[PDB]
């Protein structure tokens, strides 16, 4: 199917408690594969998925250098943004960066991404054209002007259309037994009387990969969107994810309710009902 690679950087200042901490993690789809943490005893890029372990020492050395350089760049950037917002030296602040490439089912570049936030609010983003920027405010306009002056977008475009796709395609091949394997959800419906004339029907999806799933309740074939409690999809810790959707129904009316499940790993969509 489709696939993506992303790097996620977080730089966090902490005045009085040393230099800002820089973390980087890398994902392919919903699978993390590398990490770097400037607070580690001996900071170096470390593997987090088995299929990346086969990469050689130059790879790990290249990654580590890159992240050590970023550590110092983001420290300067935090000092710069503090300035742009006339903020005190006293507070903690966070820059987050996301970037990477999306591929379509054929392996072709679908689009690239590069976006940043400051204190959890959008700050600046590379537009889909991979040429121009969208700046959130007059501070980010300073960054935009700097990046326009240094032709950052052109360099971003080159990476996103080139190395990003090249390396993603490699990882997809090297990790093909997992990254290109969709594990369908295991599903079932549970019943929990609430009172004499209401019960909860909870539909479960367990053990699935990737995390993308649709899980709805219908009553008489009509979506019960407002009435369904739908928990956030959550990691099981073994690469797979879990989710449930619950509806409170009138006693005796359980069979006017159906749980519908859509997921890549399914030979076909499921329709489930409580089975007393």
């Amino acid at each position: 199917g489709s696939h993506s690679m992303r790097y996620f950087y977080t730089a966090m200042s902490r005045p009085g408690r040393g230099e800002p901490r820089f973390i980087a993690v890398g994902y392919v789809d919903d699978t993390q594969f590398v990490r770097f943490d400037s607070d580690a005893a001996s900071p170096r890029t470390e593997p987090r998925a088995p299929w990346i372990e086969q990469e050689g020492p130059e790879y790990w050395d290249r990654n580590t250098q890159i992240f050590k350089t970023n550590t110092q760049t983001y420290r300067e950037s935090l000092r710069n943004l503090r300035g742009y917002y006339n903020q005190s030296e006293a507070g903690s602040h966070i820059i987050q960066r996301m970037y990477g490439c999306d591929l379509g089912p054929d392996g072709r570049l679908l689009r690239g991404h590069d976006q940043s936030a400051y204190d959890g609010k959008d700050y600046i983003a590379l537009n889909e054209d991979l040429s121009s920027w969208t700046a959130a405010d007059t501070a980010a306009q300073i960054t935009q002007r700097k990046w326009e002056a240094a032709r950052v977008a052109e360099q971003r475009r080159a990476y996103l259309e080139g190395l990003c796709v090249e390396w993603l395609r490699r990882y997809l091949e090297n990790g093909k037994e997992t990254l290109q394997r969709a594990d369908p959800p295991k599903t079932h419906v549970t019943h929990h009387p609430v009172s004499d004339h209401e019960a909860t029907l909870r539909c479960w999806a367990l053990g699935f990969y990737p995390a993308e799933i649709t899980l709805t309740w219908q009553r008489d074939g009509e979506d019960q969107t407002q009435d369904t409690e739908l928990v956030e999809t959550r990691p099981a810790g073994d690469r797979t994810f879990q989710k449930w959707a619950a509806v409170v129904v009138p006693s005796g009316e359980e069979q006017r309710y159906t749980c519908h499940v859509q997921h890549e790993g399914l030979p076909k969509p499921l329709t489930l009902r409580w089975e007393p």
């Binding site: 790097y7 990654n63 240094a150």
Partner: peptide
């Protein structure tokens, strides 16, 4: 693989 980014180009 992450992008190589010199500080003099990529600083905010």
């Amino acid at each position: 693989c992450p992008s190589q980014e010199p500080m003099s180009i990529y600083v905010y």
